[PDB]
Design a protein around this nucleic acid. Structure first.
Lengths: 82, 71
DNA sequence: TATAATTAGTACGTACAAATA
DNA sequence: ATATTTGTACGTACTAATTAT
């Protein structure tokens, strides 16, 4: 189902960018143990759909989390909790 | 094939080489994204991929509207 | 003092390749 | 061998922060 990236500002103790909201959410899944090490997160398509954002935005978020070391990716395979 | 690298990775290598050879020193600005785009003949996205990786790696840092610098 | 220009940031999109399932 | 999925590369349009006029 659907997750809200809540609609954005230009002046109110600023909201995170959408990619950063996605980062926080996915990170939350890991931290709350909704996803375990070496378990697969949803596909980029699924994430696009459920967060209501572009593939670009999803890849920005996931790329950041991979560089932080709590996700890893395999081309054609998936993205998994580290 | 054995020698092939994606464009963003070749850009990464070159900028890194600038840093490593001390051609660009800490807190000195690297060229703009436009300048890199022109110098390498690639898209702005590819440049940002390169630089983003190098920042994430700690080699560079960026200031929006300011520039990107040797860390 | 205040604008315009420059420059990096965010975010939507397409197209195709490469690796996996 | 097909379909799925992540990777590479590019396009386009703005915004936000800094810099120069």
């Amino acid at each position: 189902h659907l997750e809200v990236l809540f609609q954005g500002p230009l002046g109110s103790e600023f909201m995170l960018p959408k990619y950063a909201q996605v980062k926080e959410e996915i990170s939350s899944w890991i931290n709350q143990g909704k996803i375990l090490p070496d378990q697969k997160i949803p596909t980029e398509n699924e994430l696009m759909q459920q967060f209501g954002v572009s593939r670009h935005t999803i890849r920005k978020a996931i790329g950041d989390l991979v560089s932080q070391g709590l996700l890893y990716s395999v081309q054609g395979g998936g993205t998994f909790v580290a």
